[PDB]
Ligand SMILES: Nc1c(C(=O)O)ccc(Cl)c1O
């Protein structure tokens with residue numbers, strides 16, 4: 001049993017509540033597994049969209065959240081009300097908004113193999129064009145993402161929309 | 171959204187309770203997805219052991235169950251008490267026992283790629299030797315498993331232990 005014995009999930013979540021809020025936001029349950037199993041808390045809003053080459057499973061255990069999506073070339077929104085489950089197909093662009101403190105969402109993903117890249121994207125509030133995209137070989141979510149977001153926020157040119165000139169707020 | 175919108179999980183389980191009991195036992199949530207997401211009810215006991223080449227995720231939503239394992243060359247048991255989660259590493263032999271009516275376990279697995287086979291095994295109650303093993307390219311759990319189990323139960327030679335001569339009960 002390389003990942004240990006069964007354990008009570010509500011108590012695990014209770015015990016890690018202080019990581020389930022800014023600034024950490026989320027905590028991985030088991031390390032170095034093929035299934036990446038995370039609990040995500042809140043509050044947290046964000047402007048980036050995720051392009052995951054594989055499926056994502058959501059089970060909104062506590063509180064309510066929602067996903068900003070690009071569904072059919074249009075800005076759409078999928079609500080994760082408390083008790084909801086959801087399977088997200090590969091490559092659907094999604095931007096999770098988690099407004100509530102104390103919320104908890106079970107999120108299950110797959111380790112990406114070598115050369116299968118994730119994308120992180122920003123779109124213009126005024127004209128809906130892609131403003132900036134970066135692709136990454138994601139090895140640890142908490143380690144390799146913050147500097148990416150930061151370099152976007154720090155660069156006016158990276159936030160400048162190539163279509164209408166509006167500088168994304170970051 | 172090829173797999174539909176988010177939906178309430180407790181209500182889904184309630185609605186499918188009549189499939190969550192003999193003879194069906196279990197119901198897949200979404201079809202033709204990479205993540206195979208199933209809810210398993212009860213009662214059900216069984217004698218076969220599963221050799222899954224990939225990881226298995228368990229979240230025991232309702233009631234209690236347990237897994238007979240072969241952990242370190244010894245018969246062992248992992249309890250799934252109500253509220254427990256658990257990640258099973260690849261190739262750990264497991265035989266789920268689900269004694270309680272009305273229980274519900276969320277089980278998440280991966281679609282096996284071509285040429286990655288599952289194994290189903292029986293061991294002798296008297297000497298612990300492998301009695302019989304079959305490997306299968308598992309494409310649909312409910313379709314390709316019952317005839318396998320049945321052909322084991324129907325054959326005295328298949329149930330005859332090659333080490334001590336005892337005929338497995340089936
Ligand atoms: N969808 C998420 C979320 C989320 O939904 O907020 C947090 C962390 C990770 Cl790794 C995700 O894939």
Ligand SMILES: Nc1c(C(=O)O)ccc(Cl)c1O
Nearest residue numbers: 196208210226266277279311
């Ligand atoms: N572990 C299981 C179970 C179980 O735990 O009873 C039922 C169906 C499937 Cl497809 C599984 O992988």
Ligand SMILES: [Fe+2]
Nearest residue numbers: 050052056094
């Ligand atoms: Fe994601």
Ligand SMILES: [Fe+2]
Nearest residue numbers: 124127161164
């Ligand atoms: Fe623009």
Ligand SMILES: [Fe+2]
Nearest residue numbers: 220222226264
């Ligand atoms: Fe299994």
Ligand SMILES: [Fe+2]
Nearest residue numbers: 294297331334
């Ligand atoms: Fe034997």
